[PDB]
Amino acid sequence: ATCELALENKSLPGTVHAYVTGHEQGTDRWVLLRPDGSVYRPDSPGAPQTPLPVDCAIPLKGAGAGPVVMTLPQMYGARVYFVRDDKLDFYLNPGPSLVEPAFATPTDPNYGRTWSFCEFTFNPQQLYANISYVDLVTALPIGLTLEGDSTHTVAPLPDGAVQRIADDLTAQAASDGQPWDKLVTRGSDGQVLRVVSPQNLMAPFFDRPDQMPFRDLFTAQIDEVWEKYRSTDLRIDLQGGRGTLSGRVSGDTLTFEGGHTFVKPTSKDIFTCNHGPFANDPADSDDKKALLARIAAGFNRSIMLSHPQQPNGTTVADYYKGGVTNHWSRVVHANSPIGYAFPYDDVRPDGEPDVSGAAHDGNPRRFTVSVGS
Numbered sequence: 001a002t003c004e005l006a007l008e009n010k011s012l013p014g015t016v017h018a019y020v021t022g023h024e025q026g027t028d029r030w031v032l033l034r035p036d037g038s039v040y041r042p043d044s045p046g047a048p049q050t051p052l053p054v055d056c057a058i059p060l061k062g063a064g065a066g067p068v069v070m071t072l073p074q075m076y077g078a079r080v081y082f083v084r085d086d087k088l089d090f091y092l093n094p095g096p097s098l099v100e101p102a103f104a105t106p107t108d109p110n111y112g113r114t115w116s117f118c119e120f121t122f123n124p125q126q127l128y129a130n131i132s133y134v135d136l137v138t139a140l141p142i143g144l145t146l147e148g149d150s151t152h153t154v155a156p157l158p159d160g161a162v163q164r165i166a167d168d169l170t171a172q173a174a175s176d177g178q179p180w181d182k183l184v185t186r187g188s189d190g191q192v193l194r195v196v197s198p199q200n201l202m203a204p205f206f207d208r209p210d211q212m213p214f215r216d217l218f219t220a221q222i223d224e225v226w227e228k229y230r231s232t233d234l235r236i237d238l239q240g241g242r243g244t245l246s247g248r249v250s251g252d253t254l255t256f257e258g259g260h261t262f263v264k265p266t267s268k269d270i271f272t273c274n275h276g277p278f279a280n281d282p283a284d285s286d287d288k289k290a291l292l293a294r295i296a297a298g299f300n301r302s303i304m305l306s307h308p309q310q311p312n313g314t315t316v317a318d319y320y321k322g323g324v325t326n327h328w329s330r331v332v333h334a335n336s337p338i339g340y341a342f343p344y345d346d347v348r349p350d351g352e353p354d355v356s357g358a359a360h361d362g363n364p365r366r367f368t369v370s371v372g373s
């Protein structure tokens with residue numbers, strides 16, 4: 001089966017291009033959709049850093065003129081990119097391995113361009129798409145609509161969001177002296193191109209951790225939490241009817257009934273949600289994995305001291321209070337109507353609404369991706 005892909009520019013002036021990349025079903029082979037509606041499957045190149053030998057930029061009709069509609073073949077690990085005025089430079093490495101534009105590295109050929117992307121997957125069970133602010137927010141916000149069985153819509157960042165986000169974060173940096181302003185990327189014309197989450201600014205310095213930005217942001221708060229739960233229980237509700245598990249800190253290990261163990265975390269762990277006690281290990285039981293997500297979420301939201309039982313009984317109003325918190329997440333949530341801002345933002349108290357930026361349908365007919373408003 002297939003379905004229609006509709007690319008639209010609602011209101012921006014001039015020229016916008018879209019790119020569709022992914023892996024085709026089972027072959028695992030990199031693949032790009034072509035302006036003419038056909039598929040381009042590159043062969044492995046003769047050298048690294050080889051320019052994409054076919055032009056796969058898809059020109060969008062003018063703002064308001066309607067959509068470019070083509071046939072979407074099934075694929076996974078897929079993306080839709082947009083870029084204004086220019087095109088994007090893609091490359092090939094021996095494999096074939098597609099070299100993707102790196103929003104968070106300043107030497108990248110596209111670093112100064114105005115571009116964005118969202119991620120999707122289309123297998124025979126469903127089309128699943130996702131607007132996510134876990135990594136970046138851009139001056140080219142994407143919204144989408146999926147028609148099939150149901151109709152699902154995901155609202156974009158509103159016009160101007162990325163400027164507000166950049167200003168709020170610079171304002172934060174002015175007060176706490178932390179490198180929040182370095183997450184901003186401004187072109188040559190003064191305009192804001194994107195803002196990136198702290199982990200994307202920290203990962204360069206994983207090599208040299210003694211120079212990592214933000215390395216000591218959470219250090220005091222973490223020690224406060226660990227000392228609290230040396231003398232009283234931390235109750236984590238696994239939810240879904242699985243009930244709660246109580247934990248205590250012995251020395252530097254937080255241990256829950258069932259022998260689930262978490263070492264003292266670092267600011268790095270909290271921001272990545274994937275190191276220290278939050279590293280994903282396939283050798284972990286499901287309870288251990290439930291505990292991990294909820295504890296990472298609570299540190300990001302700074303509710304570990306205020307709420308000994310969580311997430312049930314907490315609300316969004318409890319999140320991101322005080323000087324030391326995940327201000328990236330706080331500010332993105334303030335300036336966006338829906339979508340996640342950090343890797344475990346999906347943790348929510350029972351009864352609270354789903355605020356994920358995903359849309360999915362088991363029988364997709366048209367997948368509309370748009371820019372502008």
Ligand SMILES: OC[C@H]1O[C@@H](O[C@@H]2[C@H](O)[C@H](O)O[C@H](CO)[C@H]2O)[C@@H](O)[C@@H](O)[C@@H]1O
Nearest residue numbers: 076077078079118119120121134135136
């Ligand atoms: O910016 C988000 C991250 O993109 C990552 O690539 C995604 C995953 O591999 C996922 O499975 O597939 C989607 C496309 O459907 C990709 O976007 C990953 O490469 C990260 O480095 C990157 O920060």
Ligand SMILES: OC[C@H]1O[C@@H](O[C@@H]2[C@H](O)[C@H](O)O[C@H](CO)[C@H]2O)[C@@H](O)[C@@H](O)[C@@H]1O
Nearest residue numbers: 077078119120121123125126128129130
């Ligand atoms: O669309 C890309 C994003 O897809 C995500 O993984 C999906 C969900 O887990 C869903 O339940 O199952 C579908 C498979 O049909 C997955 O595509 C999401 O977890 C991201 O990693 C990814 O960027």
